[PDB]
Every structure is written in C-alpha cells, then in structure tokens.
Amino acid sequence: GLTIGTHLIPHPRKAETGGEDAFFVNGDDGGVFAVADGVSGWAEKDVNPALFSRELMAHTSTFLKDEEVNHDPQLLLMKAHAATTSVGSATVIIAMLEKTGILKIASVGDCGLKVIRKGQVMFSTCPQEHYFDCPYQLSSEAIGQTYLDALVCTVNLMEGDMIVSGSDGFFDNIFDQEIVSVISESPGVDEAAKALAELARKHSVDVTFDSPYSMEARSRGFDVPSWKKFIGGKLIGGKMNDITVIVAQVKAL
Amino acid sequence: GLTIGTHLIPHPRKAETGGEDAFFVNGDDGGVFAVADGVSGWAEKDVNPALFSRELMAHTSTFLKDEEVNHDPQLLLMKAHAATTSVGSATVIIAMLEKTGILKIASVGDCGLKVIRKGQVMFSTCPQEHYFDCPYQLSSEAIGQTYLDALVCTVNLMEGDMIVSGSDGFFDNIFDQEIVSVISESPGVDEAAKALAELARKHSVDVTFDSPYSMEARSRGFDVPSWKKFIGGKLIGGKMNDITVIVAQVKAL
Numbered sequence: 001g002l003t004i005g006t007h008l009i010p011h012p013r014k015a016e017t018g019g020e021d022a023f024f025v026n027g028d029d030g031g032v033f034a035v036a037d038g039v040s041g042w043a044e045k046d047v048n049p050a051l052f053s054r055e056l057m058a059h060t061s062t063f064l065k066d067e068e069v070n071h072d073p074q075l076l077l078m079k080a081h082a083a084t085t086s087v088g089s090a091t092v093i094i095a096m097l098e099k100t101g102i103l104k105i106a107s108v109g110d111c112g113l114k115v116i117r118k119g120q121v122m123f124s125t126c127p128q129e130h131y132f133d134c135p136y137q138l139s140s141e142a143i144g145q146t147y148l149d150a151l152v153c154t155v156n157l158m159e160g161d162m163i164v165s166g167s168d169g170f171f172d173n174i175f176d177q178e179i180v181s182v183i184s185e186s187p188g189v190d191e192a193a194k195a196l197a198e199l200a201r202k203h204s205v206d207v208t209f210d211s212p213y214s215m216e217a218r219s220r221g222f223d224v225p226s227w228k229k230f231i232g233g234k235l236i237g238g239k240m241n242d243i244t245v246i247v248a249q250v251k252a253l
Numbered sequence: 254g255l256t257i258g259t260h261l262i263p264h265p266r267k268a269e270t271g272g273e274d275a276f277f278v279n280g281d282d283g284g285v286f287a288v289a290d291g292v293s294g295w296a297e298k299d300v301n302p303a304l305f306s307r308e309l310m311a312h313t314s315t316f317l318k319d320e321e322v323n324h325d326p327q328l329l330l331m332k333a334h335a336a337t338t339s340v341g342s343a344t345v346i347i348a349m350l351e352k353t354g355i356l357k358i359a360s361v362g363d364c365g366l367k368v369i370r371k372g373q374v375m376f377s378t379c380p381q382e383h384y385f386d387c388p389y390q391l392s393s394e395a396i397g398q399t400y401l402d403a404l405v406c407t408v409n410l411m412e413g414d415m416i417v418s419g420s421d422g423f424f425d426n427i428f429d430q431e432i433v434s435v436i437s438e439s440p441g442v443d444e445a446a447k448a449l450a451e452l453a454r455k456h457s458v459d460v461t462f463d464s465p466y467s468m469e470a471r472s473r474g475f476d477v478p479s480w481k482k483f484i485g486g487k488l489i490g491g492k493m494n495d496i497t498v499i500v501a502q503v504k505a506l
C-alpha cells in the first residue's frame with residue numbers, strides 16, 4: 001500500500017479559480033494516484049484550461065471501477081480520455097501500486113514521477129515533448145496525442161521507498177537533491193508534500209534562481225550570447241506555473 | 254526481437270588486456286544483453302581487475318538457460334553473482350525484451366540504459382552510488398551489494414525504438430543530445446554503436462570537454478576552494494575509462 005500526501009499551489013494569477021492542474025488520489029487499497037496539467041495556451045481560445053484536466057481526473061476515478069482496465073494505467077488513460085468532452089488539453093500521469101510492490105505508470109507529456117530509495121533518486125520518468133515546452137498532450141483536438149503515445153513503464157518498489165510525482169510546475173522549479181533533502185527532513189508525507197510544493201513555489205517566482213527549466217532552456221539553444229552573460233543579463237529564473245505535488249510512502253508489501 | 258550492435262574501446266592504458274568492461278549479447282530470439290564494468294582500484298589489491306566482470310557475464314549467459322530465472326533479470330543477477338568466484342567487483346545491467354515489447358531491466362551501479370523514441374530520450378536509468386564515483390557494485394566481498402539492491406524496472410517498447418546501453422565510461426563522456434544526434438544520423442546498429450563509442454572516447458581524453466562527469470562533480474561541491482585545493486586543481490575534462498556501447502533496435506513485435 002501507499003501512505004499518500006498531496007499539496008497544490010496554483011499560479012498566483014490563476015489562484016482565484018484554483019489553477020489548471022488537477023489530481024486524483026486513492027490510498028485505501030494498493031495505492032493509486034494521477035495528475036493532469038491543463039495546458040496554459042487555451043485561454044487564447046476563450047477556453048478554460050481547467051475543465052479538461054478536471055474532467056480527465058473525474059473519469060479516471062470512474063474507470064478505476066472498470067475491471068477491464070483498472071490494472072493498466074495506459075488503458076485507464078484510453079478510457080478517461082475518450083470520455084472527456086470538455087474542450088482543452090492536458091499532460092497526465094497515472095501510477096498504481098500492486099500488492100507485490102510493482103508500481104505501474106503511464107504518462108503523456110511532462111508530468112513526472114521519481115522514486116527515492118536510500119537517499120537518492122533511483123527512478124525518474126522522462127518528459128515527452130514536440131519541442132521545448134510543447135509537451136505531448138491528450139486533447140479535444142485531433143492534433144493531440146492518444147493513449148498509444150503514452151510512456152508505459154513499471155518499477156519494483158520496496159518498503160520505505162518514497163514516490164514523488166507532480167506537474168511540470170513542480171519539476172521545472174526544484175532539483176533532485178532538493179527533493180531528497182526536503183524529504184529527509186520532513187516527518188510525514190503531508191508535511192513533505194507541502195514543503196516540496198512551497199520550495200518549488202519560492203523558486204518559481206524567483207527571477208534570480210537558475211532553475212531546472214532555465215538550465216534546460218540554455219541547453220536547447222535559447223541562451224544569450226556568451227559575451228552577454230553578465231550578472232543581471234543571464235538566461236535564468238524560475239518558471240511560474242501551477243504546482244502539484246504527490247508524496248507517497250510504500251508500506252505493508 | 255532486437256537487432257543488436259556493440260563496440261568496446263578500452264581505457265588507453267589498458268588496451269593490451271582489453272580493459273575491465275565485459276558484455277554479453279544474444280539477438281537470436283526475443284533479445285537480451287548485459288554489461289558489467291569491473292571496478293577500477295582492484296589492481297591495488299594485486300587482483301586481476303577484469304576477471305570478476307568477465308566471469309559474471311559468462312555465468313549470466315549460462316543462467317539464461319535456467320528456466321527458473323531466465324525471464325527475470327534480477328534473478329539472473331542473483332544466480333550469476335553467487336556463481337562468481339573471481340575476486341573483484343563490478344557494476345552491471347541486464348536487459349531482456351519479451352515478444353510483447355516489454356523490456357525488463359535489472360541494474361546494480363552506474364551502467365546505464367536509455368530508450369530513444371521519436372527523436373528524444375523517453376526512458377533513462379538512474380545510477381546508484383554510495384557517494385560520488387563509488388557505485389553500488391556486486392562483489393566477492395561482503396561489503397558489496399547483492400541482487401536485493403538492484404533497481405528493477407520495465408518499459409514498454411514499440412517497433413523502431415532504439416536502446417542505448419553501456420558502462421559509465423560511455424555515459425560520463427557523452428550528453429543525451431549527442432546520443433540522439435548520432436542515432437539520428439546512423440544507418441544501422443553497428444554504425445551507431447561504433448560512432449557513439451568513438452565520440453565518447455574522443456571526449457574522454459579531452460581536457461577541454463566539460464563532460465557530464467566533470468559537470469556532475471562540480472554540482473556536488475568539488476569545485477569549492479577546500480576541495481579544489483585538496484585535489485590540486487579544478488576537476489575538468491573527460492573521464493578516461495573503458496567504454497562499452499550496446500545499440501539495439503526493436504523489431505518484429
């Protein structure tokens with residue numbers, strides 16, 4: 001099973017309506033969770049990006065009671081996506097722990113999941129994108145991706161392992177060593193999820209912080225010329241974004 | 254199945270004996286390969302540093318004919334390790350493709366495996382270490398790790414996926430985008446394995462190349478004045494090492 005804690009911090013400008021990230025958690029049995037990040041660009045269509053991600057999570061809850069798909073995260077995505085009628089799009093990850101400790105994962109886009117064991121990250125999902133900051137995404141539009149495009153994987157867990165999952169707003173704004181440090185000094189999953197989300201939030205609004213996002217952008221060629229890299233002029237900064245964090249401790253295998 | 258190509262370049266000062274990396278490949282059925290990196294430093298014990306990795310690979314091939322373990326990389330490691338009598342130690346990875354396209358992996362230490370799909374890395378193993386450059390390792394000595402310490406995972410593959418695996422001598426000396434670039438311009442697995450190994454080799458002997466190894470060391474704090482003064486200068490350049498590259502293309506699922 002999993003002991004699961006969660007925290008969400010919307011982008012400051014979108015806080016009034018709850019942001020556009022959505023999630024699902026059920027820790028009653030083996031342990032299951034999901035995160036969906038509604039894609040920011042939809043406001044330009046006079047479309048609320050939160051409807052699609054929220055509906056995707058609602059249908060995930062329903063299809064978890066469908067015995068033909070409820071042990072296969074990729075097939076859960078298939079059914080939840082097909083049932084979603086709201087206009088919009090989202091990145092999404094679903095993870096479920098079997099009683100044997102096998103964690104099954106399906107991911108479309110740039111949500112993420114890491115496993116921390118014995119003080120280090122030993123498993124980390126890779127984001128999918130068409131180009132920088134344009135993720136694979138499930139959509140109301142034919143141009144989007146489908147369950148066939150999901151990254152589908154598993155990892156065998158052991159008691160005491162810590163799973164950390166969330167949206168790109170989290171991972172773009174926090175380094176692996178910070179995740180490990182915060183986890184180590186938190187007394188429980190609820191406190192860990194809040195402290196992790198708050199640290200990412202602090203970084204996300206800090207224009208002076210060299211975030212994973214800004215480092216990654218410089219690696220792609222978005223950098224300024226090397227002769228213009230004075231202090232005050234570098235391509236650095238957190239990435240303001242909705243932040244969703246799920247922290248899950250493996251128990252009773 | 255897998256179409257598999259390989260290329261090995263020993264450390265320039267260990268070429269006469271072939272270095273201390275070892276590997277096994279079998280592309281005749283569903284596809285399986287393994288890499289073991291004998292740990293540098295056993296030569297200080299006056300121990301033949303290549304014997305443990307070579308023997309571990311030999312026993313891996315034998316236990317691939319043991320029906321009790323031959324569909325479980327972690328159990329293959331268990332048997333191969335227990336059968337190895339040579340003094341020494343090694344990091345190791347075993348990967349096995351089922352006919353469904355499920356790639357099963359078990360890894361101890363800092364060998365690595367990446368999956369490249371549609372022009373990007375979509376899966377990447379995480380190295381295990383006790384501290385910087387001191388990896389988890391299977392050993393002749395009680396202080397080493399066992400199969401219970403392996404990271405065990407799977408990833409679902411599709412036709413055309415490219416698997417790139419190898420020892421730390423490869424991954425410490427090449428960036429993911431170089432791997433993707435070389436794979437993109439290679440007409441076959443043999444050509445990719447040789448081009449990848451040769452590029453890593455060129456980097457490994459280049460004091461001017463800011464290698465993944467040297468960047469990682471700086472991110473740990475070995476560039477601070479106390480550690481820089483202790484080692485005698487900045488930690489820079491490629492990392493000289495045995496280089497092993499396996500490239501496998503997914504076919505006929």
Ligand SMILES: C[C@H](CO)OC[C@@H](C)OC[C@@H](C)OC[C@@H](C)OC[C@@H](C)OC[C@H](C)OC[C@@H](C)O
Nearest residue numbers: 041042045087089130134137139141143144145
């Ligand atoms: C993934 C790919 C990248 O290759 O692109 C991502 C894309 C999904 O995100 C772009 C999005 C922010 O803009 C949506 C845009 C495509 O509008 C759709 C339009 C054609 O619908 C017409 C029609 C009147 O709509 C009626 C309304 C009721 O739905």
Ligand SMILES: C[C@H](CO)OC[C@@H](C)OC[C@@H](C)OC[C@@H](C)OC[C@@H](C)OC[C@H](C)OC[C@@H](C)O
Nearest residue numbers: 294295298342383387388390392394396397398
């Ligand atoms: C058999 C002989 C016969 O005389 O008995 C002598 C015995 C004392 O063996 C010598 C041994 C100490 O040499 C091992 C060393 C050369 O390699 C270091 C590595 C194996 O340990 C790292 C290990 C995982 O990590 C350690 C720490 C980071 O947790």
Ligand SMILES: [Mg+2]
Nearest residue numbers: 037038039040
């Ligand atoms: Mg969003």
Ligand SMILES: [Mg+2]
Nearest residue numbers: 110127133168
């Ligand atoms: Mg991104």
Ligand SMILES: [Mg+2]
Nearest residue numbers: 110133135168
């Ligand atoms: Mg995003």
Ligand SMILES: [Mg+2]
Nearest residue numbers: 290291292293
């Ligand atoms: Mg070695």
Ligand SMILES: [Mg+2]
Nearest residue numbers: 363380386421
């Ligand atoms: Mg290393």
Ligand SMILES: [Mg+2]
Nearest residue numbers: 363386388421
């Ligand atoms: Mg090494």
Ligand SMILES: [Mn+2]
Nearest residue numbers: 037168169241
């Ligand atoms: Mn986001």
Ligand SMILES: [Mn+2]
Nearest residue numbers: 290421422494
């Ligand atoms: Mn090596």
